[PDB]
Amino acid sequence: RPTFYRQELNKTIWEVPERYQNLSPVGSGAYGSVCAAFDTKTGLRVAVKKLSRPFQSIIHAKRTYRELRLLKHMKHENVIGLLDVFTPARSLEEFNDVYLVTHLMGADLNNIVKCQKLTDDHVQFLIYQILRGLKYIHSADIIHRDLKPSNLAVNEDCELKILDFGLVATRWYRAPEIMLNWMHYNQTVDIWSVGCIMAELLTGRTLFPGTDHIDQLKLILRLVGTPGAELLKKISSESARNYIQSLTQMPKMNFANVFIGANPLAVDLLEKMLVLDSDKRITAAQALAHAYFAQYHDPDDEPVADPYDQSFESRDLLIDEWKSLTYDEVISFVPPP
Ligand SMILES: O=C(c1ccc(Cl)cc1)N1C[C@@H]2C[C@H](C1)c1cccc(=O)n1C2
Ligand SMILES: O=C(c1ccc(Cl)cc1)N1C[C@@H]2C[C@H](C1)c1cccc(=O)n1C2
Ligand SMILES: O=C(c1ccc(Cl)cc1)N1C[C@@H]2C[C@H](C1)c1cccc(=O)n1C2
Numbered sequence: 001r002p003t004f005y006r007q008e009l010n011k012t013i014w015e016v017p018e019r020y021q022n023l024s025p026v027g028s029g030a031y032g033s034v035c036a037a038f039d040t041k042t043g044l045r046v047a048v049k050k051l052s053r054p055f056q057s058i059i060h061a062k063r064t065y066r067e068l069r070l071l072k073h074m075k076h077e078n079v080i081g082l083l084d085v086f087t088p089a090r091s092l093e094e095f096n097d098v099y100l101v102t103h104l105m106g107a108d109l110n111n112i113v114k115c116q117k118l119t120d121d122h123v124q125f126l127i128y129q130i131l132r133g134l135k136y137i138h139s140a141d142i143i144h145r146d147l148k149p150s151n152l153a154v155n156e157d158c159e160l161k162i163l164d165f166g167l168v169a170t171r172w173y174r175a176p177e178i179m180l181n182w183m184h185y186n187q188t189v190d191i192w193s194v195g196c197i198m199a200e201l202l203t204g205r206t207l208f209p210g211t212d213h214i215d216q217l218k219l220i221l222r223l224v225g226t227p228g229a230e231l232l233k234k235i236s237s238e239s240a241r242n243y244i245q246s247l248t249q250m251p252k253m254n255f256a257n258v259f260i261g262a263n264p265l266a267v268d269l270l271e272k273m274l275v276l277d278s279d280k281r282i283t284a285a286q287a288l289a290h291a292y293f294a295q296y297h298d299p300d301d302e303p304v305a306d307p308y309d310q311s312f313e314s315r316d317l318l319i320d321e322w323k324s325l326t327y328d329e330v331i332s333f334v335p336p337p
């Protein structure tokens with residue numbers, strides 16, 4: 001066991017191995033607060049994330065478990081990975097805190113776009129990297145579910161990683177089917193989000209800045225058009241079907257008339273990503289092979305993931321059970337080479 005030391009930063013006491021030095025608060029998310037630190041083992045600047053109230057409730061405990069399971073799985077250039085996980089607890093009995101250690105990236109994509117529209121070349125590279133990471137995540141039958149600029153980190157080399165959570169309204173980036181059904185949907189919900197992000201990088205503006213869920217869908221249908229009969233016939237919920245059928249008919253827009261002056265290949269890709277019907281939306285693997293990425297695409301360096309056991313997602317367990325499973329995962333952790 002390493003030697004731990006204690007310090008108070010903000011409202012919270014941090015107890016970490018002496019390996020991590022010069023902790024400095026950088027901010028907090030919904031699921032925890034984060035300090036930048038110097039990692040004496042690697043010489044790297046790292047992010048140390050202390051999860052908030054990890055075992056407060058059943059859903060908190062299951063969320064903590066989920067977070068650790070997902071982070072332990074991710075081994076890809078374009079996805080956040082786990083450098084270390086630790087607890088100051090010496091036994092399961094006293095186990096109440098979870099710290100996660102990851103690479104510290106320079107900024108998030110919200111910071112970058114909040115002043116600038118990016119050149120097409122830089123958009124190619126950023127979206128390429130997001131899709132490369134997504135191919136990997138999706139290959140493990142994992143859906144991210146919350147891709148947005150604040151959940152994408154970039155360093156000074158313009159290298160990008162998809163994050164677990166950031167430190168920008170989710171609804172603005174959410175696929176329209178997450179309002180119309182739930183039976184069900186697929187990995188392309190993340191592709192919708194990528195489309196929204198790409199549009200924003202190209203224009204400097206949020207594509208669909210809805211004030212609420214009704215406004216959100218209205219803004220979406222103004223671009224992509226109101227559903228045709230062929231899509232309507234695939235909607236199982238009477239209320240959802242009647243909701244969208246009661247809207248005033250909006251024709252689909254030619255995206256070239258919206259993203260004026262953009263690379264025609266960029267516009268073509270956006271047309272394929274922002275399809276209303278998720279059965280017809282482009283996949284991450286398909287998108288990587290799109291002509292827009294001709295400068296970057298390498299079918300032999302776009303790896304897939306090891307299989308991920310998400311059977312736990314369907315289980316209903318007690319707080320101490322999720323807590324015990326989380327403890328197992330801390331103990332079994334093997335640091336990356
Ligand atoms: O896991 C998802 C989910 C969440 C977001 C996205 Cl983009 C895709 C699927 N769902 C399973 C259930 C019901 C729906 C869909 C849903 C929508 C929004 C949040 C949420 O937790 N859930 C949980
Ligand atoms: O499933 C994930 C998730 C978690 C970790 C990683 Cl590495 C990728 C995605 N997310 C979906 C939403 C919001 C974020 C991101 C999130 C982070 C951590 C736990 C969690 O339940 N959630 C639920
Ligand atoms: O059938 C609906 C539903 C869906 C959309 C609209 Cl506008 C109204 C009701 N719901 C029943 C459950 C829970 C909620 C509401 C819901 C919201 C969005 C999608 C969905 O499948 N469901 C399934």
Ligand SMILES: Nc1ccc2c(NC3CC3)nc(-c3ccccc3)nc2c1
Nearest residue numbers: 176177179180181182234235236237240
């Ligand atoms: N094969 C499909 C394809 C698309 C779908 C979709 N997308 C519409 C843009 C909202 N929505 C819904 C649905 C079903 C029940 C309740 C709420 C939504 N189902 C779909 C099934």
